[PDB]
Design a protein around this ligand. Structure first.
Ligand code: CDL
Ligand code: 3PE
Ligand code: 3PE
Ligand code: 3PE
Ligand code: 3PE
Ligand code: 3PE
Ligand code: EHZ
Lengths: 54, 125, 52, 87, 177, 63, 39, 170, 98, 459
């Protein structure tokens, strides 16, 4: 319960949750086309966020 | 017949393997002294040394502490018999006593509310 | 005498400053000087402040 | 309380006891005289000798250190060395 | 405690070390000396017979049934001497056996008294450093060809040399401090 | 482990005895006060409400 | 005593164009120190 | 001590009635204690008190004027309520040393009346409940953050009961 | 392997300065760093401090309350009032929800 | 209270301006006197607490600590004169100043009227501590330990920041005086049930609770002796002081929102006490001893009965002094031995006769021997806990038996048995080592004579 279970649950898990989240968000091609379309997606969603909450 | 238990183990005598003289056994039994003799002539050749101030290290003890407090989580793999047993130990009693203390505290409160608990000469808390 | 004893006077001086600053806190928080209920008395003869 | 032993009082007792063992002749016991090659005693009689000494001097001569108390003298320095008698 | 442990035990030393435990565990049940000196010369008889068995197999079958006869016919509270491991005075006086390398941190005042004591102590420390080289070299030049290696250490073998590794068998805190 | 005590048992005993001489001589010659009635308008000062003299010396001079 | 100052290996990790190297990200290599490339 | 705040019963002692020729080993000793232990001390003590009476000084007992109690104190007015939580926290102690005295006065009345404590000492224990049933009714449920507002509520939760029960009896 | 220093041994400060007090290597600083620490440490904090703390008068009013009780118990008992009445805030002051 | 503080600040100028050779004595001698000025706050002589000025106050709960915080700076600077005597003359003056700022900050935190003043100063103390642990930490793992000490406290801290700004909007001022004399009664909603957890959790984290205490064993292990003394004696108690002043508000919820923690702490007390029973690192065992004896405190600051609170105040001051004493003597063995292992170094009394007497008295303080404030403390928390539920004695009864066992085991396998054959010969005891101890225990003996001063706000 000390060491592994109380270190894998609270202290270590929070370590992993983030580590993994940075790995996906920061693995970027660096190509402009990809990045830009993401700008496209954003414009679309924000257009909607206004639209539906008109 | 003496019956060794995990405690009260089988004595040296009364132990069959002691009565084993197969070539191999007398080859290990003489090989193991060597390891010990070797290690023995590596302590005394470092403890009986004049001109020494540094700390004889006993690395066999350093391999023990590292194995016991800093080589544990690098060798943890969550299986069953480990997480079931790793939850019964942390939450089991912690939930047991809650229904031990809630039931008592609730019994007490009811009785106080209904007017039965004497609380006599109790002027402190 | 300031030759390595001007060092030794640094902290002692901090105490003095401390008390001063502290006794200039009282001077500020002096409303209810003597207007408190439990301790309101007529200034006895020759006393212009109950507590200074 | 009692007086400390000596390298000649730990030798007169060791010869004393042995001179009282019937098998060991009391006139051919000499301190440099081996128990098994010179006096004649067997292996089982070494255990019995040592044990007498362990009971004359009140301490236990460990097994491994006592599989060799052959000479009737080794017994006299080993006992003394174990009891710190520098004479 | 002095000599080194042999690797494996022979048949003999196992038999002859029962003759000790046995006879010594017969003097707990039989306390009075006479009863003992009787019930014991009868013990030797048991060991005396079956002495010349040449059939090893048999011999190791008398030994293995002797040590089980013994285990079940032993005394729970035998007579173990006062100063031996498991005894009543074992390691009692060890609270007074300081390890002698501690007189080296004494204040020059303390060592001021007790003057001749330290004059002889400084001689012995000169002996120790004066031979470490010839010793370790001996210990090594005489390392028998790699193979079986026992904890037995060599004697001197030359004048002036001191038995290799002798600083802690000599200079050992006195038993009764 | 002995030089320490001659120094600890000393510098306690250095300032300790002049205190003990002080508590004893004050408590002997000067003495604790006896309780009394506030005399119709005395309005006693802060120091007047404490028994032991040096315990009201500190009060009069510093608090 | 030598409070453990970091050795070369502790230092090594901080090299590489990404601290926590991913599956494909690790394949990358640190940017040129001069800020000029060989291509 | 005020013979009246710490009472103490009058003493009744059986008179000496020796019926043995032997000499009491106590009377002789006392005759000594009185000379070699008491007289010497007695002499010193007096000399103490005359040293005291020369510069005799006095110390009074602060008397605290009574300020308005929380029961009457504006809500939110931290000034008035502060002066009124102290007036109570003060009486939380004066009402506590009183209970210290009944703890004590009793203890003595069961050492002074052994084997009769069951009976002779019931003047107090009747009081130790007349005082404990009150201390329990004004200061007990409260947390460690005892405040006059909470005694005001501990009471007033029950003043309903001495008014709901009463009305209920009808 | 990289260049780095060989392990520094810890000196037996008790070999020189056999009067080492544990504060500093050179002897005079040591003496003057214990002559001022035992003094300011023990001689005028544990002694003058305990003297002052012992003489704090009637700390937290508990010397005052053992008298105020005595005159209240003196006054309440002689006048026949209950020694600790059972309601403190008078019932008259309270305006219970009607 | 600016004499306990301004003169303190001036210590920093003295550590820097002073000669490299004389820097140590000027600083230690002066803060001993700084402690003497601190003793003036003890002059209460009346119920009304002492509001020195708008921002600075000292009530019975803070006063017993401010004096301890001022007292340990001298001692901390005396226990770290050895290690840190191998530095470059500017690393020292940094360490000395770091220690000085801790009590400047800690003195103010314990003497602060506004709860957010507590928060800003509360969470600032991490900066000085993390530097002491990480910069001078001997082991390879202090970078890790520092991370654990910063994140566990920080993740707890931001919820408290939101909660205190929240109450300021709900009530209109975070002034502990007013908040006390004003009606702040939570309404047992689901949200309030969260507020309560927000305020208590940050305090519960640095007061190691069974669930989040892994930071303390790791931190004290590699921390230098001065950092380990500060963490055990003053740093952990910051969490307790906070729980006493913050639960004045959130008055109704803790009646039923405490069960979770209370049970976590009492079961935690048993398991933390027990793992002390087989832990090879001595500093490790003292740290878990600290977790268990602090688990008792969170179980008295939550039952909230007058006796609990001052049981808590008694134990916190007492255990603070005892723990340091244990951490200080552990260091003296560590410096000569050069290893934290408990199994090595057996028989020391044979070679260090007095340190062993200090070891014995420290252990008897560690376990509850009766003419000690340590026992009075536990006896009181034990009583109230019993009042909460008579069954509590079972769990607070397995802890007493275990606490006796590990406390004596530290004495039995470190200071008795046959001497270790020939570790690097153990140089005799310095007078500093022994005083640093004497300075810890002589106050423990003096406080036990008159326990009233450290009894808390409740009594
Ligand atoms: C022929 C010879 C005849 C001799 C007759 C007597 C002569 C004589 O001396 O006259 C008495 C005369 C005083 O008597 P008095 O004037 O009649 O009245 C005294 C006042 O009423 C009171 O004056 P005071 O209280 O200011 O002075 C005395 C006081 C002075 O106080 C101090 O000294 C403060 C500290 C100074 C430290 C200095 C270093 O000493 C104490 O208060 C001692 C307190 C208790 C100390 C021991 C610890 C008790 C508790 C133990 C802890 C464990 C308890 C467990 C309980 C468990 C329960 C379940 O002179 C003194 O004795 C003064 C004594 C001063 C002692 C100072 C050193 C104390 C250490
Ligand atoms: C209720 C109690 C809650 C306790 C929360 C404790 C949070 C901190 C636990 C320990 C975190 C930790 O150990 O971080 C290590 C992790 C990886 O760092 P490391 O392995 O040093 O790699 C860098 C060098 N390559 O570093 C990380 O990846 C980030 C770890 C967390 C950092 C803070 C996260 C805050 C999240 C708030 C939501
Ligand atoms: C709030 C915090 C959200 C964190 C995660 C955001 C994106 C989540 C998601 O839906 O996909 C992850 C996104 C793309 O996936 P990626 O990480 O590249 O890898 C995928 C294969 N593993 O990961 C990314 O590449 C980064 C994406 C960042 C921008 C997307 C998130 C926008 C969130 C709503 C913004 C609305 C603005 C309106 C104006
Ligand atoms: C070692 C010393 C042991 C001493 C035991 C003393 C027992 C006293 C008598 C207890 C039983 C009669 C009590 C009568 C008055 C109290 C009545 C009451 O209100 O108790 C209710 C309580 C209910 O508890 P529970 O079973 O959880 O009910 C859940 C319902 N859904 O009912 C209970 O209280 C059930 C539990 C009774 C016993 C308490 C638990 C004792 C466990 C000891 C474990 C020791 C080791 C602990 C772990 C650390 C070491 C491994
Ligand atoms: C880890 C250590 C423990 C952390 C606990 C965090 C708890 C959530 C953050 C702080 C919650 C809080 O401040 O409680 C009170 C707050 C507002 O409650 P209330 O006063 O009712 O206002 C709402 C309208 N009446 O209620 C809330 O703020 C609830 C907010 C819930 C979501 C906050 C973000 C959570 C992120 C994880
Ligand atoms: C690690 C543990 C170390 C040893 C701890 C020993 C004390 C543990 C005490 C825990 C329980 C305290 C009392 C809790 C309330 C129990 C219920 C109650 O109200 O008590 C009254 C009861 C007598 O009531 P009665 O009507 O006669 O019926 C019997 C069952 N109640 O009387 C009781 O039944 C009280 C319950 C037991 C109290 C005495 C326990 C004696 C334990 C002897 C050794 C047990 C093994 C250890
Ligand atoms: C106390 C309870 C006592 C119970 C003890 C139990 O009875 C033991 C008993 O008596 S049963 C003795 C029989 N024990 C043997 O029979 C071994 C014989 N072993 C040989 O004969 C070998 O061949 C050898 C040549 C090496 C003997 O030579 P040596 O005499 O040992 O030196």
């Amino acid at each position: 319960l000390d060491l592994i279970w109380l270190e894998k649950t609270i202290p270590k898990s929070t370590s992993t949750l983030h580590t993994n989240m940075t790995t996906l968000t920061t693995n970027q091609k660096g190509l402009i086309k990809l990045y830009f379309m993401s700008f496209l997606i954003n414009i679309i969603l924000i257009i909607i966020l206004y639209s539906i909450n008109l | 017949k003496y019956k060794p238990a995990p405690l009260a183990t089988l004595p040296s005598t009364l132990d069959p393997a002691e009565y084993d003289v197969s070539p191999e056994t007398r080859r290990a039994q003489v090989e193991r002294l060597s390891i010990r003799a070797r290690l023995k002539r590596e302590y005394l050749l470092q403890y009986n040394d004049p001109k020494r101030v540094s700390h004889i290290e006993d690395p066999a003890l350093i391999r023990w502490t590292y194995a016991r407090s800093a080589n544990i989580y690098p060798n943890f793999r969550p299986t069953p018999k480990n997480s079931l047993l790793g939850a019964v130990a942390g939450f089991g009693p912690l939930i047991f006593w809650y229904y031990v203390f809630k039931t008592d505290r609730d019994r007490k409160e009811r009785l106080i509310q209904e007017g039965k608990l004497d609380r006599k000469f109790n002027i402190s808390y | 005498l300031l030759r390595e004893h001007w060092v030794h006077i640094l902290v002692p001086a901090g105490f003095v400053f401390g008390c001063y600053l502290d006794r200039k806190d009282d001077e500020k928080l002096t409303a209810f000087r003597n207007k408190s209920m439990l301790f309101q008395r007529e200034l006895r003869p020759n006393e212009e402040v109950t507590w200074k | 309380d009692a007086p400390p032993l000596t390298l000649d009082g730990i030798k007169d007792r060791v010869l004393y006891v042995l001179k009282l063992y019937d098998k060991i002749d009391p006139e051919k016991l000499s301190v440099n005289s081996h128990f098994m090659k010179d006096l004649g005693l067997d292996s089982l009689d070494q255990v019995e000798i040592i044990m007498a000494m362990e009971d004359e001097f009140g301490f236990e001569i460990p097994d491994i250190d006592a599989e060799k108390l052959m000479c009737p003298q080794e017994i006299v320095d080993y006992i003394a060395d174990k009891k710190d008698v520098y004479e | 405690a002095f000599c080194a442990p042999p690797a494996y035990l022979t048949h003999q030393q196992k038999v002859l070390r029962l003759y000790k435990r046995a006879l010594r565990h017969l003097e707990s049940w039989c306390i009075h000396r006479d009863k003992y000196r009787y019930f014991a010369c009868l013990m030797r008889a048991r060991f005396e017979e079956h002495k010349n068995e040449k059939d090893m197999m048999r011999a190791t079958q008398l030994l293995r049934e002797a040590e089980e006869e013994f285990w079940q016919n032993q005394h729970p509270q035998p007579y173990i001497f006062p100063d031996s491991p498991g005894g009543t005075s074992f390691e009692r006086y060890e609270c007074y056996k300081v390890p002698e390398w501690c007189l080296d941190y004494w204040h020059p005042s303390e060592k001021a008294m007790y003057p001749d004591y330290f004059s002889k102590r400084e001689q012995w420390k000169k002996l120790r450093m004066e031979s470490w080289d010839r010793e370790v070299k001996q210990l090594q030049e005489e390392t028998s060809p790699d193979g079986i290696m026992t904890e037995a250490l060599p004697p001197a073998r030359r004048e002036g040399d001191l038995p290799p590794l002798w600083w802690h068998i000599v200079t050992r805190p006195r038993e009764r401090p | 482990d002995a030089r320490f005590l001659r120094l600890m048992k000393f510098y306690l005993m250095l300032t300790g005895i002049p205190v003990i001489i002080g508590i004893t001589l004050v408590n002997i010659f000067i003495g604790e006060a006896e309780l009394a009635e506030i005399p119709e308008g005395y309005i006693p000062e802060h120091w007047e409400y404490y028994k032991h003299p040096i315990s009201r010396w500190i009060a009069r001079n510093f608090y | 005593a030598r409070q453990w100052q970091p050795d070369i290996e502790w230092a090594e990790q901080f090299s590489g164009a990404v601290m926590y190297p991913s599956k494909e990200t690790a394949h990358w290599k640190p940017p040129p120190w001069n800020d000029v490339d060989i291509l | 001590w005020d013979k009246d705040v710490y009472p103490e019963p009058p003493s009744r002692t059986p008179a000496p009635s020796p019926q043995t020729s032997l000499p009491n080993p106590i009377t002789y000793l006392t005759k000594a204690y009185d000379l070699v232990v008491d007289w010497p001390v007695t002499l010193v003590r007096e000399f103490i008190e005359r040293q005291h009476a020369k510069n005799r000084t006095y110390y009074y007992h602060r008397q605290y004027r009574r300020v308005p109690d929380i029961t009457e104190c504006k809500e939110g007015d931290v000034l008035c309520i502060y002066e009124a939580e102290m007036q109570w926290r003060r009486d939380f102690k004066v009402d506590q040393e009183i209970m210290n005295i009944i703890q004590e006065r009793l203890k003595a009345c069961q050492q002074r009346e052994g084997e009769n404590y069951q009976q002779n000492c019931a003047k107090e224990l009747e009081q130790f409940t007349k005082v404990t049933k009150a201390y329990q009714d004004r200061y007990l449920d409260l947390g460690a953050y005892y405040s006059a507002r909470k005694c005001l509520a501990k009471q007033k939760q029950r003043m309903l009961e001495e008014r709901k029960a009463a009305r209920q009896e009808a | 392997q990289w260049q780095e220093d060989p392990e520094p041994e810890d000196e037996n400060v008790y070999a020189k300065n056999p009067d080492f007090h544990g504060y500093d290597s050179d002897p005079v600083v040591d003496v003057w760093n214990m002559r001022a620490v035992f003094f300011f440490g023990f001689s005028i904090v544990l002694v003058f401090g305990t003297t002052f703390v012992a003489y704090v008068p009637d700390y937290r009013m508990q010397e005052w309350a053992r008298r105020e009780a005595e005159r209240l118990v003196k006054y309440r008992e002689v006048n026949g009032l209950p020694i600790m009445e059972s309601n403190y805030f008078d019932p008259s002051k309270i305006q219970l929800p009607e | 209270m600016l004499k306990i503080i301004l003169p303190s600040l001036m210590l920093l100028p003295l550590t820097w301006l002073s000669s490299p050779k004389k820097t140590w004595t000027n600083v230690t001698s002066y803060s001993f006197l700084i402690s003497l000025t601190s003793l003036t706050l003890l002059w209460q002589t009346d119920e009304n607490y002492k509001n020195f000025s708008n921002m600075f106050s000292s009530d019975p709960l803070s006063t017993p600590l401010i004096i301890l915080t001022a007292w340990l700076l001298p001692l901390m600077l005396m226990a770290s004169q050895n290690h840190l005597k191998k530095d470059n003359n500017v690393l020292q003056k940094l360490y000395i100043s770091m220690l000085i700022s801790l009590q400047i900050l800690l003195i103010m935190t314990f003497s602060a009227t506004e709860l957010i003043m507590f928060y800003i100063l509360f969470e600032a103390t991490l900066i000085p501590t993390l530097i002491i642990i990480t910069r001078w930490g001997n082991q390879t793992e202090r970078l890790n330990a520092g991370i654990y000490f910063l994140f566990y406290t920080l993740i707890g801290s931001i919820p408290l920041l939101i909660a205190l700004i929240l109450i300021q909007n709900h009530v209109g001022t975070l002034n502990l005086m007013i908040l006390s004399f004003t009606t702040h009664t939570l309404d047992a909603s689901w949200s309030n049930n969260l507020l309560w957890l927000a305020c208590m959790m940050a305090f519960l984290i640095k007061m190691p609770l069974y669930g989040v205490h892994l930071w303390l064993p790791k931190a004290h292990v590699e921390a230098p002796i001065a950092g380990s003394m500060i963490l055990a004696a003053i740093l952990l108690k910051l969490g307790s002081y906070g729980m006493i002043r913050i639960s004045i508000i959130l008055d109704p919820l803790t009646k039923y929102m405490a069960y979770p923690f209370i049970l976590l702490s009492l079961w935690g007390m048993i398991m933390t006490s027990s793992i002390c029973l087989r832990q090879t690192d001595l500093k490790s065992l003292i740290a878990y001893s600290s977790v268990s004896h602090m688990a008792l405190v969170i179980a008295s600051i939550m039952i909230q009965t007058p006796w609990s609170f001052m049981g808590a105040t008694m134990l916190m001051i007492a255990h603070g002094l005892t723990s340091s004493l244990l951490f200080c003597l552990a260091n003296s063995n560590y410096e000569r031995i050069h290893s934290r292992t408990m199994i090595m170094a057996r028989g020391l009394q044979m070679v260090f006769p007095l340190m062993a007497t200090w070891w014995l008295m420290a252990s008897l303080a560690n376990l509850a021997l009766p003419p000690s404030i340590n026992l009075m403390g536990e006896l009181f928390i034990t009583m109230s806990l019993f009042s909460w539920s008579n069954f509590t004695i079972i769990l607070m009864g397995i802890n007493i038996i275990i606490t006796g066992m590990y406390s004596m085991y530290m004495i039995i396998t470190t200071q008795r048995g046959k001497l270790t054959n020939h570790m690097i010969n153990l140089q005799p005891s310095h007078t500093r080592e022994l005083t640093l101890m004497a300075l810890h225990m002589i106050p423990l003996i003096l406080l036990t004579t008159s326990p009233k001063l450290i009894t808390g706000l409740t009594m």
